[PDB]
Amino acid sequence: AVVPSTTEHRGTDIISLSQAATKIHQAQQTLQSTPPISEENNDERTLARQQLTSSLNALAKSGVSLSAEQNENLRSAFSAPTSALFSASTTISDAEIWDMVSQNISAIGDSYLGVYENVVAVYTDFYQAFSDILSKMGGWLLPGKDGNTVKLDVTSLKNDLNSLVNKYNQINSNTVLFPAQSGSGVKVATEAEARQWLSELNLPNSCLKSYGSGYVVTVDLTPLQKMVQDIDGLGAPGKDSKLEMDNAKYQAWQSGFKAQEENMKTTLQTLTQKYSNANSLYDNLVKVLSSTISSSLETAK
């Protein structure tokens, strides 16, 4: 080829670089606009990453050239990471580096981000449910028949709470934070792994539960369960109606009920913030990617 061109890349190379940029961006847009709040949503995030992965393999497979800086840039940002499902972290060829990028980014997208997504999706759904019960408090609290007393429909409150605790007490694909429950038939992890993610999510050991050959991490039911305990503690209700109690008794019970609600709120917040940092971390990798692919298309003629 003695005719002037705009790039040392091949037409077949350019097609790959192009599709990669497409996937990279569609991925980045998907991951930034679709929150991990529903199972369907997570499927789309997961998909966007898989397609971004494929695009990368195509690049590596195609053996698409790469300048020195591009190689070192890509290398640096992607090499030597993913240790302990924590965040921890020569002349390497071009085909070799795409494979690395394709390998590592996928690990992060799955073993890390993917977990956080699933965590926020489960914890979200879980707190939502608790919120809904909480909105029924209206028709469950009425001032005392005479003067200073208050009637609490302890029974209905307790029933609801219990159903909630009962639902998430099971071990299925709607109550497991880690590992993510893909498919039919419970997915367990080793205890070391279970405990790693337990630390990562700053969750109590109670969230750790065994299932056959392995372990899984669930939501934290301690708060809800203390709530039920206290309700049981107010003493058996009236005949079949509500339980009456004076102010002191009621005041103390309520503050406690708020303390427990407050607890879930704090767990949840730590989870979403941590999810955020994960998602961000992944995005920065996707930026480096788009940045390298962009530099690779620059008119080098």
Numbering used by the authors: 32 to 120, 127 to 338
The authors write:
Bacterial infections including Salmonellosis and Shigellosis affect millions of people every year. These bacteria use a T3SS to secrete virulence factors to manipulate host cells. The T3SS is a multi-component system that forms a continuous protein transport channel through the two bacterial membranes and the periplasmatic space that extends into the surrounding medium by a needle structure. Tip proteins, which bind to the distal end of the T3SS needle, are thought to play an important role in this process. SipD from S. typhimurium, IpaD from Shigella flexneri and BipD from Burkholderia mallei are tip proteins that are thought to interact with their corresponding needle subunits PrgI, MxiH and BsaL, respectively, to make the needle tip complex.
We solved the X-ray crystal structure of SipD, the needle tip protein of S. typhimurium at 3.0 Å resolution. The crystal contained 4 copies of SipD in the asymmetric unit with structural information for 306 of 343 amino acids. Here we report structural features of SipD chain A, which, compared with chains B to D, showed continuous electron density for most amino acids. SipD is predominantly α-helical folded and can be divided in three structurally different domains. The central domain, domain 2, (green in Figure 1) adopted a coiled coil structure with two helices of 47 and 52 amino acids length, respectively. The bending of the coiled coil of domain 2 allowed us to distinguish between a concave and a convex surface. Domain 2 is joined to domain 3, an α/β-structure (yellow in Figure 1). Domain 3 is in contact with the convex surface provided by the coiled coil of the central domain. Domain 2 and 3 of SipD share high sequence homology and similar three dimensional structure to the orthologs from S. flexneri (r.m.s. deviation 1.3 Å with IpaD) or B. mallei (r.m.s. deviation 2.2 Å with BipD). Notably, amino acids involved in intramolecular contacts are identical or highly conserved in all three orthologs, suggesting functional relevance in T3SS tip proteins.
